[PDB]
Design a binder for this molecule. Structure first.
Ligand SMILES: [Ca+2]
Ligand SMILES: [Ca+2]
Lengths: 223, 223
């Protein structure tokens, strides 16, 4: 998260860190045993970490659970990033408390101009390297499709949405990938791609969750 | 036991010590004349030691009985350790008292997350040699089958259960083999195998007692 702020502790209860020796991607908790994240964050062995705040210090509220199943969307396209979404079924169900809590799924799609919350333990700078220890938060709105498509000529699908600022300075970055975009208590996006981080005229491009409610449900009823 | 504590004296009345000139394996008393253990703990001549606490000092409470019959499970695979259970018929029936007591057999297969008791006079270190004099105890839960198979690829059968901690530090070790895992006053496991002792991602493997009640009773009734 470039240009956001440090989230108040345990204030995005549904955020998870995907661990593979170190943090590499975020996701979000949809029920007690399923996490949604991004196909591009696929790894054959993932440990999910919940109730985190400081990613590099054991604080006493974490639950560490292995992925039992890792299911990329059948139409995931690596080249284009189309359908970038994946589901993770945890080896066991977590303990739901004030710090580990689900996030709802959209009842419809949120229109452009809606105000959303974005979070992650991804890069905090436009140029250079800085990985934070504390979870960063970012208030940003969905942008009109028109604006999304002009930024990325012929690069945008019916399942991608841009969230951000055309001016730059405030964005998601590497390490935020698979994490949540939440709009009026609902999971509307998933960090997917962008050119650089927080550059002018290159807003974040996100997976549009509203297009996959049916899939999810389905996937979870079948596994 | 690596990471456990000194059992309170005579607190695990059903523990036995398999003796061949020295303690080499554990086991549990199931009736006044039958003990259960692992098939790998098979020796043609065994002396059973009941009422023990300090493996190495005579305390006034022990009963020393020879094994009159030693029955390995017919399906016992040496290579794989599948069917890792045996039955020992003692030469005479013991004296049942507060220090030499039986343990119940399973009424059902206990579920992942059940809290269990593991005990033994096995190695107490994760690296290095340390064989204790006093019987050691460990509180550990049964783990989801999912974690168990993820730990030991193509190694886990329907008759094996993992018990312990994925983070390592606390486990059974050589010399604990054949001992009991008691959960809710019943015999859910027998120490079987593991890679090393108390290493991260190498939880112990146990014989799933609940798949056997029927063979046991079968066994005790025919001999
Ligand atoms: Ca932490
Ligand atoms: Ca003794």
């Amino acid at each position: 998260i470039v240009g956001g702020y440090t989230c108040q502790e345990n204030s995005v209860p549904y955020q998870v860190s995907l661990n593979s020796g170190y943090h590499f991607c975020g996701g979000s908790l949809i029920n007690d045993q399923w996490v949604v994240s991004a196909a591009h964050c696929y790894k054959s062995r993932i440990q999910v970490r919940l109730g985190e705040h400081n990613i590099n210090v054991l604080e006493g509220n974490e639950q560490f659970v292995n992925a039992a199943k890792i299911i990329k969307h059948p139409n995931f396209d690596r080249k284009t990033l189309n359908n970038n979404i994946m589901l993770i079924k945890l080896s066991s169900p977590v303990k739901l408390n004030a710090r580990v809590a689900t996030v709802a799924l959209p009842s419809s799609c949120a229109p452009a101009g809606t105000q959303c919350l974005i979070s992650g333990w991804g890069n905090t700078l436009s140029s250079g390297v800085n990985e934070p220890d504390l979870l960063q938060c970012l208030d940003a709105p969905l942008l009109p499709q028109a604006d999304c498509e002009a930024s990325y000529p012929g690069k945008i699908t019916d399942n991608m949405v841009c969230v951000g600022f055309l001016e730059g300075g405030k964005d998601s970055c590497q390490g935020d990938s698979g994490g949540p975009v939440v709009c009026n208590g609902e999971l509307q996006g998933i960090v997917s791609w962008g050119y650089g981080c927080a550059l002018p005229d290159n807003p974040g491009v996100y997976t549009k969750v509203c297009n996959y409610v049916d899939w999810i449900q389905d996937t979870i009823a079948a596994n």
